[PDB]
Design a protein around this ligand. Sequence first.
Ligand SMILES: Nc1nc2c(ncn2[C@@H]2O[C@H](COP(=O)(O)OP(=O)(O)OP(=O)(O)O)[C@@H](O)[C@H]2O)c(=O)[nH]1
Ligand SMILES: Nc1nc2c(ncn2[C@@H]2O[C@H](COP(=O)(O)OP(=O)(O)O)[C@@H](O)[C@H]2O)c(=O)[nH]1
Ligand SMILES: Nc1nc2c(ncn2[C@@H]2O[C@H](COP(=O)(O)OP(=O)(O)O)[C@@H](O)[C@H]2O)c(=O)[nH]1
Ligand SMILES: [Mg+2]
Ligand SMILES: [Mg+2]
Lengths: 429, 430, 82, 92, 91, 137, 439
Amino acid sequence: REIVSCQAGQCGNQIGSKFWEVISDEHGVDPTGTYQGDSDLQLERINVYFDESSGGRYVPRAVLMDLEPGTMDSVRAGPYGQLFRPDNFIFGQSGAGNNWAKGHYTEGAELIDSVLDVCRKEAESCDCLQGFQLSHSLGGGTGSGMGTLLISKLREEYPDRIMMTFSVIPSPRVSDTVVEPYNTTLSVHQLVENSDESMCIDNEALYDICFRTLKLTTPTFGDLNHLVAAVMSGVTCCLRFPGQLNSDLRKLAVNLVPFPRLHFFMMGFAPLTSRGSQQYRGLSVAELTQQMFDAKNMMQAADPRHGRYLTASALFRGRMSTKEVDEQMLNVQNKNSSYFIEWIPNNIKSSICDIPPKGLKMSVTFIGNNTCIQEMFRRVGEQFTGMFRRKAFLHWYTGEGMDEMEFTEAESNMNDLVSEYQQYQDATV
Amino acid sequence: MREIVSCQAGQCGNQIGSKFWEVISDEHGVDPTGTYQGDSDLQLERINVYFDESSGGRYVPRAVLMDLEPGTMDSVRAGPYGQLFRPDNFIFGQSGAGNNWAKGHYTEGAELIDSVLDVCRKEAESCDCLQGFQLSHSLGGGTGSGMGTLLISKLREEYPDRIMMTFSVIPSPRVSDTVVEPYNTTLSVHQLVENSDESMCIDNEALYDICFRTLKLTTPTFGDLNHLVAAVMSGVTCCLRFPGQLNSDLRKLAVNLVPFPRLHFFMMGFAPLTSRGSQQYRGLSVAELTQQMFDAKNMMQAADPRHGRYLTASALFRGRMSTKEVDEQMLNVQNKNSSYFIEWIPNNIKSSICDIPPKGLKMSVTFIGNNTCIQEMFRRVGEQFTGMFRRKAFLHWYTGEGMDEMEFTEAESNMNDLVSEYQQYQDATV
Amino acid sequence: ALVQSNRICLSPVLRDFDRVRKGIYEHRTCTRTRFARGLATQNIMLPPEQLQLLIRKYTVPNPDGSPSSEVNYYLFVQDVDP
Amino acid sequence: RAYRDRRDDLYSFTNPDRDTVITPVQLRRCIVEILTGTPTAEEMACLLEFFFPHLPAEAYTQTRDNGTTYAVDLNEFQKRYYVMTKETMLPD
Amino acid sequence: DAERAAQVAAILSRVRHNVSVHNALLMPFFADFDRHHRGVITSSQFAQACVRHRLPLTETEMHTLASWYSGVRYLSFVRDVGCEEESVQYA
Amino acid sequence: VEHSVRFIRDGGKMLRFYGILDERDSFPGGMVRKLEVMLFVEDNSMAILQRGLYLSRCWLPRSGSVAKANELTFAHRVNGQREPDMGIPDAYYRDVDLDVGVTLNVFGRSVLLYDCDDYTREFFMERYGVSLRQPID
Amino acid sequence: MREAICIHIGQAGCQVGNACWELFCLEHGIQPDGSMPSDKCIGVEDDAFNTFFSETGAGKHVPRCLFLDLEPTVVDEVRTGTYRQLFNPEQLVSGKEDAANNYARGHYTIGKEIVDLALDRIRKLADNCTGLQGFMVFHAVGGGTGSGLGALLLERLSVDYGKKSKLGYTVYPSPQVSTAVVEPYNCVLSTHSLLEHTDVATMLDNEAIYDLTRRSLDIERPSYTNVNRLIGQVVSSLTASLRFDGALNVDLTEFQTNLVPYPRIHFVLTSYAPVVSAEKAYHEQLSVADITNSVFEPAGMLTKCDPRHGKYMSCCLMYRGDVVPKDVNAAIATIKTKRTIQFVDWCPTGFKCGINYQPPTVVPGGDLAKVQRAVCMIANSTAIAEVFARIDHKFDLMYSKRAFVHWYVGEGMEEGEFSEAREDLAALEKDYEEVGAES
Ligand SMILES: Nc1nc2c(ncn2[C@@H]2O[C@H](COP(=O)(O)OP(=O)(O)OP(=O)(O)O)[C@@H](O)[C@H]2O)c(=O)[nH]1
Ligand SMILES: Nc1nc2c(ncn2[C@@H]2O[C@H](COP(=O)(O)OP(=O)(O)O)[C@@H](O)[C@H]2O)c(=O)[nH]1
Ligand SMILES: Nc1nc2c(ncn2[C@@H]2O[C@H](COP(=O)(O)OP(=O)(O)O)[C@@H](O)[C@H]2O)c(=O)[nH]1
Ligand SMILES: [Mg+2]
Ligand SMILES: [Mg+2]
């Protein structure tokens, strides 16, 4: 029933802060944790993401992780930053240094005992813990290293619990470091082994959505985090609110993970339109489906046209009829069968939740397994082998308690995952 | 249900479409606010032909704006009814069209036709029953001609069975305000011939003559010109949008006006059209309607109907009028001037009655004619094109964006064949 | 109200009924049967009581003072359609 | 010779008189805009008193000169430069 | 009209300084506009002549000068602005 | 005649007003728009600038509907008047109409004028001798 | 959007640009300080200044201009004059010593040490422009800087920016009045640059403007001030189509395509009307037909070249102000019926028209009067062969006996450059005759 959230790195911490922005907005929770909602449905499942105190204050089931205390300080200085527990701010004195070696092996592992302690405390507090959620970036030091280490430890401790991750992977148009190849390569195999479902986010696609769709001039990290938090909150709408066809967090996993290695998804939100263009866009299931399956609306920088959809899930929120939410999926499958895997007709789950997002009448979140997710892994592998062939930047990793062959192992794991995606894309009946 | 998706290519097409939506929202009782204020249920009965409903109950036109320059986009948006159009239908590029068919059809238009077709496909899918694509453009321009031809070309394969109206403004020597009329018109007509199931030619010189002698106006701007075009552009869909004693639509018109596939070029006319001083004096009747309808000074072409013979014609009569009377007046005009018509295609004229007249008009009629004298305009354009092409002038521009002389020769041959078909059917005998 | 809703023009049909069969160009009066003729040709279905009331109000009196079988349709047209 | 104002004045635009003197407004605009200096009120008051000894204290912040009633020519400017150099020199 | 007189005097002083600096003759430029040698040119004539001479004057000041010398008495204007060959002190 | 008399005396000069157009309650996603409602006095015609041209060169009807100028009978254009007739006299807003604190019916929407520039104030004082109201928030 | 970068080479180019910018500032309402007062509003279409003026954070408007000269007198005069706060300190490049009225000096010795930072400034201006439409370079081929440095800069711009629009407003030597004796050499040598690396060349010689002002402006003794003001009025009339909205809108490439029939043939003569006397009151408002007839009349022409000796190939007319398309078309029809002017056989239409609703603006104390309507002509005609014939006959006369050639030789240019320049000019005259010849 309960989802416990963990937030690693600067990217993960800010994204989680905006996630709790959205969740408190939806559930009518003040910065001081006092309930102010106008409906009983908020209190009826407030416990999923919140825990009540003696005084009635609702504290998030959130844990914060960073080897740099600056992001923790910024979070506490934020508007809803006072909502979190004080002990969940587990921080290191020395920064992560943008190094997976000392974010995962020496400095990350030294501090990870306390984060396992608080995660255990949250798990004990939960009546029937539905699962774990993580938010981080695969290109950073502590978001990648400590995030993967937490994923591994929590997988070892709770084998039968769903474990979402939200990984902000980089793009050529966004690269603001030189070690994305190394960090991403060292993190992808850990995510493959130890995560039930991994949800990919790319700042390039976020910026493309913010300009081409939202018609913004200066879209900031706040707007990007709001966009990702919309999908994060739309994942668990069926858990937190009733609907004619709800879904737990394991519904999506079981209907979108045909094979253990294939659990990498691409995100998508609808309706998404500029403030001035809301006047004409008629809110309907057909328009929702169109913007859902539009390639540019995908907030992960890949083209679904180049690949074939393994599976899909559309979590609709609002008062809409089931006839259209079924017929639109049938229509898109029939008239774009070339974009879906042939040996699995009816690739799309459709879940219905009664409560729509605040300020909207109907909305939907898209969770999609498509083989075009292999293009980004391929480019990251090319970058990784280009840097690794000449031992570039490798001394930072090797001197901090690492070995040479594990890099080859991680590269081989990425290549195996890419090969599996390609051989399921080109497979024929 | 049955509906038309409109496209506006070039600044000419954009302003014509802006005035067309002026008129259409006037008929359907839609203020710039987009809501409905009409006094009749008949306006809402078939308002989905040109409009789509929004979440708030407002109505948005099914218009796609197309120009490589953003200036006409801004002007149309700033227009009185510019608030109706969807901003995502405003497809424009940074670099101007350069007044070049090659620029508008091969290099600058190719990179924007993807977005244009995306918008058109979205509109078509959203529509319950696609019926027609209407385009408004000028063949004498750069992006009105090249990009419009490209758009209709790529739309033809996507929707082969749906009607294709083009409202092409072909320039005239008296209104020739460019030097590449021959090149652009020649490179556009061969596309239109096989990519438009009904083309409708608008001639500025003749609309100006209408404003000068039929209306007696001294200094008119482009406003009443676009109003004149929009009059017929709206009266074509009269039976589509409103009931009548003899209903029709685009395909009824096309089936009754296109005897052979390559003869689908039409000339337009509107009646009545009187000056204010003589407005109260003249008695509006179907007799005056037909008399002005079959008169050259009311036609919208600088082509002389005496030198041609009407293969087919269509009068969309709007208003409450008697069917026997309209039909017998068409019979009377045929009998009075049988030489002006064609013997081997009897019953040349298409009378279609619409119950609802234009607002403020007791009765009206729109005339669509497949007369032969379009061969005169085709011949003059071909003569100018040959004069330019022999001396090679202004051709390095077109060859710059990848075109070759073979395309120009093929376009000239296509225009020659098109004019020769009309020449054959003018003197063809039973 | 029906007239500005449906763009109703009873003037030509009423004029034709005034001048039909008759060498008189215009008399500005017409029979009740021909008034109902014009309304029906314009497709305005009305109750018989309403039609009788309208023709009684717009009828022209005979010189002796008794009501006649003719309706002053010109005043009706002027009052209804401006 | 003058600061920006709603008036469309060549005096505030440039020095139309084309005369070889420095007015208080000219010196203030020179220090602020072309010398990339940002002195405070007291610093600029001291500078203006050093350059124009007879300028009234209320005219330090004035937005327009009174023609050329308070100005320093080339010789006076060179003398002030030599004084500022003396402040660098050793005592004499 | 004390304010107008003071403004006119200041404008004339500025033009006098500019003309003394430039040592430029204004009579041919101003008298080309006087076709009939009547000593009167209109406000546009005076404006174009002063713009020719590039005198440091704006439109409002220049119209004020034309009104003060009102047609414009360009001869008296040149006398007032003064020159080595053409000044009030010359006579 | 009168046209170029106005071009010489009133030609090219311009009256700015600052206005607020409130659309929040009208439709979802409505935004308050800061506009400049600006009147050419030679033609006596208004344009609106969104602070971005909200409204182009046009005469803005008092009723807020240009339907009678769009009338398909070409009675809207007069030979000697560039201004459309609209079929009724004094049908378009004028400078005497424009004032601070006035809600203009711009084509069916209410734009409230809250401020004017000193040039507009001076023009009104010089020609009509009316003191425009002080600006409002 | 629709940005156009102005370049000003040499003293003539600098002064012409000064007039152009003093016109543009008052046309767009921007004061010489660089700001738009909120008290009064001059223009209705905001972003109209974006073509010529770039917005700043503080709210000012910096011109997209490069005043490049090898000598510092005119650039210092600009730095001192009323437009110092308008113009950026950079893009105001002044050298240490002039090109000495020598094409070789300005193109080979002194121009090579200045073209690098000239191009740096051009790049810094262009990267700001996200929708740049073209370059407009003002210079005089008669002088040394405008010839040599102009050629070098045009070559570098052509090789750097590809096929972007390039309008060279050049003050060609006049048939009889002249300033220098090396002017024919400079004109002939600059022809290489004005042919291969100039999309449209606009002749603006001085005798035509002097004759226009002596007659239609009632000014007995005009000057370079009037010359530059008329040139700036022509430039503003050309650019008003893209700056302001109008019935017929044209752009750089829009008129360049309709104006240049062949790559070599891109020299266009210009004429402007109504150049009515602001000295003259009581002036009747001229009609469109009247102004069109005056423009077609060689009296009101900005180039000293009589079109009756040649034939028009493509005429582009910009009608600014309250202009009716039927006034325009009646004027065009009357012009075509008129027989004193002839067109070429292969260009029947030959008429390009652009109507803009903005009337011309008047500078303070300007010879031009406030008019409702005006029309500017850009005419490509075969009659322009005569000015080339005059200039190269003068070149041959002065070159047959090695006069004034040791300066060019010693300033780092080969003797064969003169011969190939003469051959190229002869080829230009020959192909003008060929295109004017009947088919
Ligand atoms: N239109 C116009 N032309 C000018 C102006 N000043 C000079 N010229 C032209 O410049 C030509 C003489 O060339 P130069 O005196 O050498 O000036 P330049 O072309 O800039 O060459 P440099 O002096 O080396 O910089 C004359 O024939 C004039 O046509 C002016 O103010 N306006
Ligand atoms: N969407 C989003 N991305 C962010 C935000 N902050 C940082 N990032 C991304 O995170 C990446 C850097 O991660 P980093 O902070 O170094 O991770 P860490 O070293 O583990 O803390 C950059 O490429 C950013 O694109 C944010 O607030 N929102
Ligand atoms: N009827 C009418 N014709 C127009 C209008 N605007 C332009 N034209 C005609 O279009 C022709 C030039 O087209 P052009 O502007 O170059 O088309 P574009 O390059 O595609 O924008 C001219 O001959 C005009 O007569 C208009 O508003 N109404
Ligand atoms: Mg039917
Ligand atoms: Mg020089």
